[PDB]
Amino acid sequence: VTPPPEKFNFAEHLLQTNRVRPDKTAFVDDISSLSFAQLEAQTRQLAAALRAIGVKREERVLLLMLDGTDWPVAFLGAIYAGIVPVAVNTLLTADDYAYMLEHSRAQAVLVSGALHPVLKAALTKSDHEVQRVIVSRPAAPLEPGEVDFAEFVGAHAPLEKPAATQADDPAFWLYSSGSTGRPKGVVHTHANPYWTSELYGRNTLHLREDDVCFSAAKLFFAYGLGNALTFPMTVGATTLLMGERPTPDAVFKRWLGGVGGVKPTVFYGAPTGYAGMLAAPNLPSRDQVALRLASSAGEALPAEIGQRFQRHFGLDIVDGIGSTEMLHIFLSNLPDRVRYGTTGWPVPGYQIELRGDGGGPVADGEPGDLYIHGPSSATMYWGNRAKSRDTFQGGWTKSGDKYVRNDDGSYTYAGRTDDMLKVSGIYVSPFEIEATLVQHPGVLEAAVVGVADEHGLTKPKAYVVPRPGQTLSETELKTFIKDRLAPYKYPRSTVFVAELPKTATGKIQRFKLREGVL
Amino acid sequence: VTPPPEKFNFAEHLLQTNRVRPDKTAFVDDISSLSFAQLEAQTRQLAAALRAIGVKREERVLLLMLDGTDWPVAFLGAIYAGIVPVAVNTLLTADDYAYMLEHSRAQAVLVSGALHPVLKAALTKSDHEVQRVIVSRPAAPLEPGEVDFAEFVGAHAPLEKPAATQADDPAFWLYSSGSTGRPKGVVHTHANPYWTSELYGRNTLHLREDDVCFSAAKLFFAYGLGNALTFPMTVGATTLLMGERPTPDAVFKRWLGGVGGVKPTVFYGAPTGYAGMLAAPNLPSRDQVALRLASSAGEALPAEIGQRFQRHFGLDIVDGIGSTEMLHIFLSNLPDRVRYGTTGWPVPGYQIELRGDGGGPVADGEPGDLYIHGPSSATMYWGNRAKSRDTFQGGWTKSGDKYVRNDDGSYTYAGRTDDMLKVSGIYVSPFEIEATLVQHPGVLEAAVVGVADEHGLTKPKAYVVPRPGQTLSETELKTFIKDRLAPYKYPRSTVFVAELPKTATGKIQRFKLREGVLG
Numbered sequence A: 001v002t003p004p005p006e007k008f009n010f011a012e013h014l015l016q017t018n019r020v021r022p023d024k025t026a027f028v029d030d031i032s033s034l035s036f037a038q039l040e041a042q043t044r045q046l047a048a049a050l051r052a053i054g055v056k057r058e059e060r061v062l063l064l065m066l067d068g069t070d071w072p073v074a075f076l077g078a079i080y081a082g083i084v085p086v087a088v089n090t091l092l093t094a095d096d097y098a099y100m101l102e103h104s105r106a107q108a109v110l111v112s113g114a115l116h117p118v119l120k121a122a123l124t125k126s127d128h129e130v131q132r133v134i135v136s137r138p139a140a141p142l143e144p145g146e147v148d149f150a151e152f153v154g155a156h157a158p159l160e161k162p163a164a165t166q167a168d169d170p171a172f173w174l175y176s177s178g179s180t181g182r183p184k185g186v187v188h189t190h191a192n193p194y195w196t197s198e199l200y201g202r203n204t205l206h207l208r209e210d211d212v213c214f215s216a217a218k219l220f221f222a223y224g225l226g227n228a229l230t231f232p233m234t235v236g237a238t239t240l241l242m243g244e245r246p247t248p249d250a251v252f253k254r255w256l257g258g259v260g261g262v263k264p265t266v267f268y269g270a271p272t273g274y275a276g277m278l279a280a281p282n283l284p285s286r287d288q289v290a291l292r293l294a295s296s297a298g299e300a301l302p303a304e305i306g307q308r309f310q311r312h313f314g315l316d317i318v319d320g321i322g323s324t325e326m327l328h329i330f331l332s333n334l335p336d337r338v339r340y341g342t343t344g345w346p347v348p349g350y351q352i353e354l355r356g357d358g359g360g361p362v363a364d365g366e367p368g369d370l371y372i373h374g375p376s377s378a379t380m381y382w383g384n385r386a387k388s389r390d391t392f393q394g395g396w397t398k399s400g401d402k403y404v405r406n407d408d409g410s411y412t413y414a415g416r417t418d419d420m421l422k423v424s425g426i427y428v429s430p431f432e433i434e435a436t437l438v439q440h441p442g443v444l445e446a447a448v449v450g451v452a453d454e455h456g457l458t459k460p461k462a463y464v465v466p467r468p469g470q471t472l473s474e475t476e477l478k479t480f481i482k483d484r485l486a487p488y489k490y491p492r493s494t495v496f497v498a499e500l501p502k503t504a505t506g507k508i509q510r511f512k513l514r515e516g517v518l
Numbered sequence B: 001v002t003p004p005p006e007k008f009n010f011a012e013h014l015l016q017t018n019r020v021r022p023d024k025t026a027f028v029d030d031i032s033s034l035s036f037a038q039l040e041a042q043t044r045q046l047a048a049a050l051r052a053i054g055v056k057r058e059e060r061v062l063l064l065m066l067d068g069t070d071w072p073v074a075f076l077g078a079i080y081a082g083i084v085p086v087a088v089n090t091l092l093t094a095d096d097y098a099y100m101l102e103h104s105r106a107q108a109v110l111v112s113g114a115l116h117p118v119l120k121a122a123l124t125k126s127d128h129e130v131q132r133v134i135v136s137r138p139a140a141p142l143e144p145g146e147v148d149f150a151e152f153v154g155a156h157a158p159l160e161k162p163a164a165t166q167a168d169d170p171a172f173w174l175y176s177s178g179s180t181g182r183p184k185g186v187v188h189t190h191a192n193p194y195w196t197s198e199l200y201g202r203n204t205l206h207l208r209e210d211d212v213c214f215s216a217a218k219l220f221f222a223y224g225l226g227n228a229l230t231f232p233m234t235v236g237a238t239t240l241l242m243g244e245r246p247t248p249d250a251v252f253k254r255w256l257g258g259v260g261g262v263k264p265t266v267f268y269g270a271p272t273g274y275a276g277m278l279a280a281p282n283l284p285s286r287d288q289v290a291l292r293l294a295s296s297a298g299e300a301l302p303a304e305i306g307q308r309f310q311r312h313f314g315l316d317i318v319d320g321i322g323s324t325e326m327l328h329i330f331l332s333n334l335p336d337r338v339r340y341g342t343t344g345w346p347v348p349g350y351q352i353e354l355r356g357d358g359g360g361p362v363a364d365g366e367p368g369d370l371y372i373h374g375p376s377s378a379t380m381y382w383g384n385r386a387k388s389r390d391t392f393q394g395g396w397t398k399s400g401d402k403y404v405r406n407d408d409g410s411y412t413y414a415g416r417t418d419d420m421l422k423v424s425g426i427y428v429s430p431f432e433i434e435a436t437l438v439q440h441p442g443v444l445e446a447a448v449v450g451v452a453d454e455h456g457l458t459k460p461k462a463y464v465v466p467r468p469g470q471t472l473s474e475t476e477l478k479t480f481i482k483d484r485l486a487p488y489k490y491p492r493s494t495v496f497v498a499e500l501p502k503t504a505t506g507k508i509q510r511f512k513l514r515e516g517v518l519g
Ligand SMILES: O=C(O)c1cccs1
Pocket: A222, A223, A224, A297, A298, A299, A320, A321, A322, A323, A324, A327, A328, A329, A425
């Protein structure tokens, strides 16, 4: 792969790539479509619009939007102007967003109508710097000074040239959370998505122009950003976008060509989703679908899920691992080489190391902490020097995963170096779930660990000590957690216990909980 | 009143004052009591204990505690050490505390057991700097880094000398909410509570050594911090503290001598509480209480409430106004000169100005914006230069209130400059409540305004447009707010309407709602 030039604007790169195919569909959702020419026009009008309201090069904007055709316009339009979009999860709380507004110093917000209420609450509570709120598909009347995204774009002529950025200039942020503390601002450059799109999208997956890409993983997830924006636009593929929650039925409707007159050829999702679809009574048959490639990431793929999928569809699931910090997948199975029970082989262009308790070598077949050296790594966590130092160890990025290397050079997942759980693509802190449980007045103490479900997939499991003299039912506890946590975070079961295993200092021995002591 | 000396430590001042009465009760609550000598010992031991865990002069600690005897030990022990306690409301959310930990850079937290769950959530999610958590009356097993408050105090000998602070050095913080944006860290000096306690506690209320003080307003409130800490310690009075919510029965129990073998002589609380008490069937008779003085602040007092209290008790309610920023009351009725319908007269030592649209003066009988010049003003809002320069303008502090001066020199409340609601003593933003209601999936739009209840006291009232094809209930939405915000921010009723009145700009015509056009 040839490196990108030193003067490089990622948005202009993707627009230029597709000037050969102006009338091919770039993006389609339930209600709209953009050809590559339409996307280019709207991208550059948006870029002009942000500049016209006073947003300057290198300033951030918050991009808080459901998957739909306006999403890439927002993302690429900011980048075309040399403005840094901060693309965030759509299922967070107003407090989460208020922290992000302050921390990013966002100068504007691009937000879906459905998300305006949570955004409004974040604006009201925070010491933000937001100059304008631009609302895609408003679901309620606009407040004074807010503007509809379509009018905002339509009112400005296209910016005539992109910002003259460098390849190693910040281009966009994602946020990633650890087991405690506020989300961390992962800063990616203009070069980083070129690298993931070339090394993985083109050279590992072999995506091509006649593909139709559809990702259950949303655009704000590193995984989804690649799958359904950077990868397809790199090769000229058409992309299907879906705003709603990805259930089996929602996915199957698109698989069957229910939207935009297109059937996906490439699908991407989490192992949990694949398990859910294989369980579904109305799982489509091989002849109803046009899938040629199924990608998975976000948690280890249990072998039985890949084997079942292969037996039913005659397609393997290609399981890989990436991170927010590395932007996309650096260790993967290949379309024509899949070894179930492993995450495959290092992606060419990425170097992988396993380190022991002192940073030393580990013998094949022994677990080590996984570190990655490759060209898509983020530069830092913005404004967090101590966490940056821990993660970005001079050229090597520490994943937080443990792995074992096998005789054939493949790698098998061996757990985490923190206490995070990966519950269907999404990191979940057990300490967060515990913090929520102990605010129920009937709970004295709580401990949350990961447990494998009937398919081998990790879900939280809560051990709760009830407070003497209060009552507390399991149904009571379910209701309590329902609107306080997002559903992926729901414990799969709660066990009421008389006490928890602890050291003399009162630290909970969570390892004893995973070992079954209760 | 003599100014304090340049070298001045407020805690040391209060301890020194009471070296003449070591065995008199300083503080008593439902389970414990402290004489002045025992308070001094505990205060200085706590001071040493904070130093021993590495907290330095000028660093903050969060004080998140229910009213009881440990509260003044925590507050004065920090100040004795030259450490700055940040005294906060006990009814807030985890998100609320997360922000205060971050913004204060608190190095330790002193917390009541009952508030440990909410603090734990705040510590988990925040980028805080807390090294140790000291837990007063733990209600669950201690975690690593946590220590029982009595064990912590008991583990250290008294600090020999207080920190050598200056009168104008920061001594403590309180947080003040605004209509939008984060709550503001109000910085008070060592001198500030000396001035309030001399100018108001002694010289206006005439508190004396033989009083027993009892405030329904908790210690974290600027009002209660004077009432039940700085005021009584200044004169050697005994103070009754209560952890629980101040309902009429709880208050009456204490008025009657149900706790500590002491009947309060001096009561303090919001007009809301006085209305609740006067409406109560079990309201005590005169001959059952020892009350000699009844103070009110936190909202304007309806004349009818003071008049009924006086008819029943032969005591007036003495209404005054203070602010977090001015630390205590600067405009007040006097114990023997009360004019109901007014907040009385300037407190000697404070100058008061009303200013109209141009910054100029206003005629008597017309409203103006209230500004105060007095010696207890906070210095700034920590880390907020813009709001500091807007509030603290060369010796004048802007209250955000409007008032009218009457012909007799008394002052009558005329509303706010910023749409804040003052609900039972607590400033509440209607915009916070609204932005929260709109997250309800059945709500299309919502506006919240302040409406008088049946006693004339302002409560939030919500006007909601439901989403077409949804039916909502009042109580559902009360719950929805209690589950997300501090609980007393809940709208007392919700009116469901088809549309909100708006300007041509799409701005909500809040004045129409408040004026009752839609009911
Ligand atoms: O495995 C994962 O979580 C990811 C794959 C690509 C970006 S993140």
